[PDB]
A paper describes a structure:
Comparison of different [name] conformers indicate that the C-terminal tail is also conformationally dynamic, as has been observed for the yeast orthologue and predicted from SAXS data for [name]. By contrast, when domain I is positioned close to the substrate [name] molecule in the compact conformer, it stabilises domain III by restricting space and forming a series of conserved interdomain hydrogen bonds. As a result, domain III arches over the [name] disulphide loop and forms a side-chain hydrogen bond between [name] Asn239 and [name] Thr58 carbonyl, which can only exist when the [name] disulphide sub-loop is in the induced fit conformation. Both the conformation and hydrogen bonding are again conserved and provide the impetus to bring the functionally important [name] CXC motif into position next to Cys57. The noncovalently bonded C-terminal conformation existing in the compact structure presented here is therefore a precursor of the yeast mixed disulphide–bonded structure. Thus, induced-fit [name] disulphide sub-loop conformation change upon complexation ultimately recruits the [name] functional motifs necessary to ensure timely PTM transfer. When [name] complexes with [name] its copper site is exposed to solvent by a shift in the Arg143 side chain. We propose that this effect is an integral part of the activation mechanism; communication from [name] via Arg104 through the [name] GDNT motif to the Arg143 side chain ensures the amenability of the active site to receive copper in response to complexation with [name].
Residue numbers in the entry:
A (entry chain B): 9 to 82, 84 to 240
B (entry chain A): 1 to 153
The structure:
């Protein structure tokens, strides 16, 4: 995937703390640069890993680590987050980063899922008054038919499927060329009960929803900070 | 977007739903709804700069403030855009919110969609507290409940 700069706030008073933090990240698969700042209590991390993993690596060495910013080097085109949740066991965090005007990095980690393929969709409204049921239909400004990420004729909200492992965790990282961060701020991200058939199922709901069953969890796609924007 | 909605939730008993409607471009925004489980009295009521709540008010940022002003009440000219003053809870802990405001909007550089709405513990002193924290947060205390403001039908 594309490189993403993650700005973590990590507490580290001593010089021995700086050495522990730098060691946990440097020499790891898919971590280009690390750039620790003692004075500012900051750790920049250029990477192709999910932020959830890079946070775990920092937290694994004693001190706590909060993620405060997200960009792709030097003008922030738009950052966002969706905290998934609701009545079931499903909960997660998915982050959106507009890399260029025509390309958006979507990346997240979701737990509490049944092993297998679950559909993932940006719906049109961010109305959680009736949980996922009040969020409306798949976000479809272009009036397209339902499809998968590969189909250029798809709903703008169509992000295809996401695989949950045997432990019910589903990690993913993908780039989408139709979904734009500030086109979907205030709308909802929803994960479904079953598999998105990508318009190819031959079923009444195939070209409408992809026939992925009930909505399990959902959150509003909220504005988050770019690099150095929340001090 | 012409309408918006927020579902306020927390650790304690405080919960609520807040609606926004703006029929005019850059017009007044009707903010109505109800919050329950508050203590009787004035409770600070603010929109934050970000809707990211992955680390509470840390990730939420400071009060929404694109004009870099200091904190004031809603009717003050020197205010943050997210400064919607105090809602008032009754003896039963119910604050029926009814507000009109033209500094906030649902479009443009004061767009509050995608941002966290918070109901706070104590009364917001409206920037008139006589110390530095009054000009930042209005001394409203801790977060009782919050949610992201989203687009509604
Ligand atoms: Zn669709
Ligand atoms: Zn303020």
């Amino acid at each position: 995937g594309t490189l993403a700069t993650l700005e973590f706030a990590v507490q580290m008073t001593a010089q021995s703390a700086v050495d522990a933090v730098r060691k946990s990240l440097q020499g790891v698969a898919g971590v280009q640069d690390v750039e620790v700042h003692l004075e500012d209590q900051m750790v920049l991390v250029h990477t192709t890993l999910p932020s959830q993993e890079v946070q775990a690596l920092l937290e694994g060495t004693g001190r706590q680590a909060v993620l405060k910013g997200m960009g792709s080097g030097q003008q922030n085109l738009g950052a966002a987050v969706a905290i998934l949740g609701g009545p079931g066991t499903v909960q997660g965090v998915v982050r959106f980063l507009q890399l260029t005007p025509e390309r958006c990095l979507i990346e997240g980690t979701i737990d509490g899922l049944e092993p297998g393929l679950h559909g993932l969709h940006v719906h049109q409204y961010g109305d959680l008054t009736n949980n996922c049921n009040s969020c409306g239909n798949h976000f479809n400004p272009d009036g397209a038919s339902h499809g998968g990420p590969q189909d250029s004729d798809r709903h703008r909200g169509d992000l295809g499927n996401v695989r949950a492992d045997a432990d019910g965790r589903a990690i993913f990282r993908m780039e989408d060329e139709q979904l734009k961060v500030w086109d979907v701020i205030g709308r909802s991200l929803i994960i479904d009960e079953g598999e998105d058939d990508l318009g190819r199922g031959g079923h009444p709901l195939s070209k409408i929803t992809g026939n992925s069953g009930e909505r399990l969890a959902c959150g509003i796609i909220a504005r988050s900070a770019g690099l150095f924007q929340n001090p | 977007a012409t309408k918006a909605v927020c579902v306020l939730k927390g650790d304690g008993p405080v919960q609520g739903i807040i609606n926004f409607e703006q029929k005019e471009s850059n017009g007044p925004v009707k903010v109505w709804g109800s919050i329950k489980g508050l203590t009787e009295g004035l409770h600070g009521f603010h929109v934050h700069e970000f809707g990211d709540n992955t680390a509470g008010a840390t990730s939420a940022g400071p009060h929404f403030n694109p004009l870099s002003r200091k904190h004031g009440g809603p009717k003050d000219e020197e205010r943050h855009v997210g400064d919607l003053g105090n809602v008032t809870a009754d003896k039963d802990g119910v604050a029926d919110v009814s507000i009109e405001d033209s500094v906030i909007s649902l479009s443009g550089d004061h767009c509050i969609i995608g941002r966290t709405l918070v109901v706070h513990e104590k009364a917001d002193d409206l920037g008139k507290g006589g110390n530095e924290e009054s000009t930042k947060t209005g001394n409203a205390g801790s977060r009782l409940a919050a949610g992201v403001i989203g687009i509604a039908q």
